[model samples]
Target: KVFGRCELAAAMKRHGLDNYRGYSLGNWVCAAKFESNFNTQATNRNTDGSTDYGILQINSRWWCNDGRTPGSRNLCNIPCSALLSSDITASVNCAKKIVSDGNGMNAWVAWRNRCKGTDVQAWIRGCRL
Candidate 1:
């Protein structure tokens, strides 16, 4: 599912992620834009044979099961496909866990490579919330 930036921001706020674990909503929005462009069904394959799933691009190697990768840590105890849904609850919950694991948004390479150190205000530009 595709989402407008404001819509996605409101959803994140509803999830208590506006300042979750000390990360700003702007950070999350910026990361989402780069990671999936707000496409809930987005998926990408890594060179290491793992896959990234959903808007936040949670990884199959540690976060979820893709049914093909053997011995995935499955830290979120959720199916990778679950993250692909428009609902976003499962994916947001999983992301919370990932952030609390101590890596913070650094768990997402997109956050590090794109959102980090960038002027993220543009991500929320024109969004009232």
Candidate 2:
């Protein structure tokens, strides 16, 4: 599913992304904006032979095992296909685990470049949080 900006914020909020793991809901929303443009089916193939999946673009190398990435720990223990679900609860939970692992939201370079250290409250401004 492709979400509009405010809709994405609302969805992320409902998924417990607000102030999650020290990052604001805007941070998550912004990552989704840049990572997948709020599209659940978004996927990016990495140069290292792994693919990124879903809204947060979670990686196949360290998170979901697509069975193609060598040495992938399958840290999230979910099939890469699950990330494409419109339900999104799976990706949201996996995203929380990513932050809890101490990687923070920097796991996605899009977050690092566009959302990190920025005043992302603007990302959620028009939405009722």
Candidate 3:
């Protein structure tokens, strides 16, 4: 499902990503903006031949069990399919798992280069957060 900017904002905020670890709803929204453009069905192949999944772009290698990664931790203990679809529950959950595991938001290259140290609030502005 493709989401509008504000729609994604509200969803992420509702799922408890808003300031989950000192990061604002804005930074989470900003991460989604570049990671998957608010599209739930998004996927991207990594340099290691692993794939990123969902709007959060949770990786198959370290997060989802795709049955393909060399040392697939499947740490989220879920199939990558859970990351797809518009539900976003699983996607948000896995994202927080990554965060608590010490990866931080820095796990996402897009967030680091495109979201961090920027005016992230714009991403959630007027979203009724």
Candidate 4:
């Protein structure tokens, strides 16, 4: 469990895709597991040969630029990295920008309105970044 108000806030922001902590964590964990097997350092090759990195499976092009350069793997653009860096609010804010923005909680809304109780595993399997 996370300790400290700032940390909790960050976590809430990151995983609180719906702005409701009580519901979003399960979806966040499920998405994280399907994306990177819970490995923060995780990296994978996309079909086009580009690399995806981090627990949220943020594409390096979007977050890191190029792995060959210093700080290429920087998580600045990865919405979830703010949570890893101890700033949950940034995480949520970033995620909101990338996945929701005007929609507020895109993933959460999608899950509830489009995917809930319909084989969560299958839904996770089909989610794309």
Candidate 5:
């Protein structure tokens, strides 16, 4: 397992986060599970034509234009190796940026609250490697 340097750097620079690496992997795994069931190539289309894709389920496919299809090589290409790496801390931290602070996790928390009465962090850990 080897995470992506560019992806992690993109995440860190984008979010300005610090010392939150340890919690990151769990968050990402949880987010992935909540959003797409760990499927890096998953996508969903809305009635308005909007879409979400990959493990973190990034919307607006324009952003993930790395040369592969939705669930083929492209989506899985980035997050899969990155998330599976020992550098999971950095990977998760970067994923946090994709979620843009708590909104993503908040949805998960809300869902968990009603369904399982659990927190995102705990759920994340439960889903971790």
Candidate 6:
């Protein structure tokens, strides 16, 4: 499923990610825009042979199993397909765990290259949250 920026912000806020791990909602909003354009079914293949899944683009290397990607640590203990759902609960939980693991939003390259150090307020502009 695809979501508008406000919907994505509200969902992220409902999942308690507004200020998660010291990162602002704008950061996640920006990252999500660049990463998957708010599509839950988004997926990307990396040059290293791993795949990224869901809105956050959690990787197959350590987060979840895509079956096609071998040697996944599955640290999130979920099938990568689960991340493709519109519910986003599991994906949010896994994202929180990822942040807790000390990588923060740096785990997402889109966050680094796009969201980081930019004027992120536009990401959440006009959102009620």
TM-score of each: 0.95, 0.95, 0.96, 0.46, 0.42, 0.96
Encode model 4's per-residue lDDT on 22-114: one tens digit a residue: 334445544554555554555676665456555555554434454443334444554323334433344444444445424333333334454
Q: Across residues 1-129, which tens digit of lDDT does each residue of candidate 6 receive?
A: 999999999999999998899999999889989999999999999987889999999898998987887766899999999999999899999999998897778888989998899998889999998
Tens-place lDDT digits, model 5, residues 1-129 = 222433433443344432243344334434455665554445675444445544454544333333343443232235333433333443344445545555544434323443233453454233212
Q: Name the candidate, 2 or 5, with the larger TM-score value.
A: 2
Expressed as tens digits, the lDDT of each residue in 51-129 for candidate 2 is 9999889999888978899977788889999999988899999999998887788787999999889999898887876
List residue ranges in candidate 3 displaced over 4 A.
none
Window of ten residues with lowest summed lDDT in model 6 = 65-74
Q: What is the C-alpha RMSD of each candidate to the true structure, in Å?
A: 1.0, 1.0, 1.0, 9.0, 8.9, 0.9
Candidate 1 per-residue C-alpha lDDT over 7-124 given as tens digits, one digit per residue, 9 for 90 to 100: 9998987898888998888899989998999999999998878899999999998999888777778999998999999998998999999999988889888899988888877877
Number of backbone collisions per candidate: 0, 0, 0, 2, 0, 0
Ranking by lDDT: 6, 1, 3, 2, 4, 5
Off by over 4 Å in 2: none
Looking at candidate 2, the ten consecutive residues that score lowest on lDDT are 99-108
The whole-model lDDT of each prediction reads: 0.90, 0.89, 0.89, 0.45, 0.42, 0.91
**Total clashes, candidate 2?**
0
| Superposition TM-score, candidate 6 onto the true structure | 0.96
Q: In candidate 1, where is summed lDDT lowest over 10 consecutive residues?
A: 120-129
Model 3, residue 45: C-alpha shift (Å): 1.1
Could you tell me which 10 consecutive residues in candidate 5 have the lowest summed lDDT? Answer: 1-10
- Top-lDDT structure, candidate number: 6
- Tell how far residue 31 is off in model 2, in angstroms: 0.6
Instruction: Flag clash pairs in model 2.
Output: none
Q: Which candidate, 5 or 6, would have the higher TM-score against the true structure? A: 6
Full-model lDDT, candidate 1: 0.90
